[PDB]
């Protein structure tokens, strides 16, 4: 190899992580909020510089390598839970929150951030503003939201949509107060999910691109796909939605340039 070449999409706007973490209001756990992030540069250093009381645990990728990865989309799910239920926000976990409110898939490949919010979400006289679902007919599928309240008939006698014995209201309140322990105090939780598809990789990250060099052996990097070889002006047929081509040996052999929308063959040098 002779040269190192980096090719990333030309996007300038930065991602709005300050609007997710520093939002005045957070949602409940049975009606958790979801935001879509795309077409922006994602610098994750602002999430490391936070004080060492932000619990940060990420699955399927290391936190250090996040700045050299492109993504199709990012999803941010925000809510507030109790102190000791942060254990349940993890793949392959069960409990009252996980079964009935928020479920994570086993192949999650995403990060979870939690922090104590007792100074904001608690009130001296009682803060019943945050709810959670306690009764459900069956466990819910990953990333499914149930914003609906109807009576739960545990027994056998039906009831006229009114509570009573063996007819329960599904939702309950948290009732946070400042005079509790550490496990009974509100916690603000943000879950980041990285959606990676066969797409033009909108959410790139901080990286400057270089000029394209052909007919020479170089180190190349297209949207995080990095390797060593020679780049030839291909004459293959890609559909407008297709981004790269795979060979019989289950490894990429052709790729589209993210700045000028042309096709290139990759060959060993």
């Amino acid at each position: 190899p002779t040269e190192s070449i980096v090719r990333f999409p030309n996007i300038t706007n930065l991602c709005p992580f300050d609007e997710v973490f520093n939002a005045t209001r957070f949602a409940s756990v049975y009606a958790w909020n979801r935001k879509r992030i795309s077409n922006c540069v994602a610098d994750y250093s602002v999430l490391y510089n936070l004080a060492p009381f932000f619990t940060f645990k990420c699955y399927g990728v290391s936190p250090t390598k996040l700045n050299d990865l492109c993504f199709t989309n990012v999803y941010a799910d925000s809510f507030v839970i109790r102190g000791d239920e942060v254990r349940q926000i993890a793949p392959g976990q069960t409990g009252n929150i996980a079964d009935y409110n928020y479920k994570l898939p086993d192949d999650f490949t995403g990060c979870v951030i939690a922090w104590n919010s007792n100074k904001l979400d608690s009130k001296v006289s009682g803060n019943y503003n945050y709810l959670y679902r306690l009764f459900r007919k069956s466990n819910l599928k990953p990333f499914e939201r149930d914003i609906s309240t109807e009576i739960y008939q545990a027994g056998n006698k039906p009831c006229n949509g009114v509570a009573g014995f063996n007819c329960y209201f599904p939702l309950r309140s948290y009732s946070f107060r400042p005079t509790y322990g550490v496990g009974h105090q509100p916690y603000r939780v943000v879950v980041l999910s990285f959606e990676l598809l066969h797409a033009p990789a909108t959410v790139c990250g901080p990286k400057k691109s270089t000029n394209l060099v052909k007919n020479k052996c170089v180190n190349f990097n297209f949207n995080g796909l990095k390797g060593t070889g020679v780049l030839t002006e291909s004459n293959k047929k890609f559909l407008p939605f297709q981004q790269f081509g795979r060979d019989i040996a289950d490894t990429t052999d052709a790729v589209r340039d993210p700045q000028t929308l042309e096709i290139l063959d990759i060959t060993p040098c």
């Epitope: 706007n13 930065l14 709005p16 300050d18």
Partner: antibody, heavy 127, light 108 residues
Framework: QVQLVQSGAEVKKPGASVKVSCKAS????????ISWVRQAPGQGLEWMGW????????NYAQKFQGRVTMTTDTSTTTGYMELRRLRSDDTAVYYC????????????????????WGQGTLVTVSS | EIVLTQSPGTLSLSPGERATLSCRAS???????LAWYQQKPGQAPRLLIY???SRATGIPDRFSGSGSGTDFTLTISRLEPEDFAVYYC????????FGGGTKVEIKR
Amino acid sequence: QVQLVQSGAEVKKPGASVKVSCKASGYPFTSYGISWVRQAPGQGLEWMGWISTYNGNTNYAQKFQGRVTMTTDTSTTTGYMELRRLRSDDTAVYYCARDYTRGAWFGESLIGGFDNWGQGTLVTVSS
Amino acid sequence: EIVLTQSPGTLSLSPGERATLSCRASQTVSSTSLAWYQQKPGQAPRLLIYGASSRATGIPDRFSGSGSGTDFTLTISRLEPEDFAVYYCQQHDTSLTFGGGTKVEIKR
């Protein structure tokens, strides 16, 4: 350092219209909104409105609901404000501020305030 | 909408005492949605406190904020010659409105 520069003073007449400009420098333009406030000589502050620099969404005060309109230009990173049908009560000083009270992308409330102010533009309305 | 009242209208102190300013809210205002500003004669305002407790960037430690619910307080532990100005409280819990203002001068 974050910087905001406003235009010069105006000697507008009643029944006219006025444009006030505010050029930003030293930060990513589209990550923050822009707020407009004013102070009449001898009185206190008075919020006029907010505009998002990402999608152009605005939010005005009901006192200026039908009279004011704000715009942005991302190329030069400059905000503009029209006020129409100037009365004798519109003689004041107008301040452009960088906003941290409402999000630029999603439009929700944040924890902060007007954390960077301009020099102020004096508008005098008299026949 | 929410109306904020600043009390009192004028504080007459000496360069070195302790000052306490009070902002009173009509309705209930969340503590995450209140801020304080200082304005010197002939200058533009500037942010001092946000979130009713947090301190803005580059603000000397002698400024502190506190309060909740319907009553908020800004305290200056020791008064310097440069701390004589006008102070404003702002809420953005329901719309956005400002306070009346409170001037702090020298008592001699």
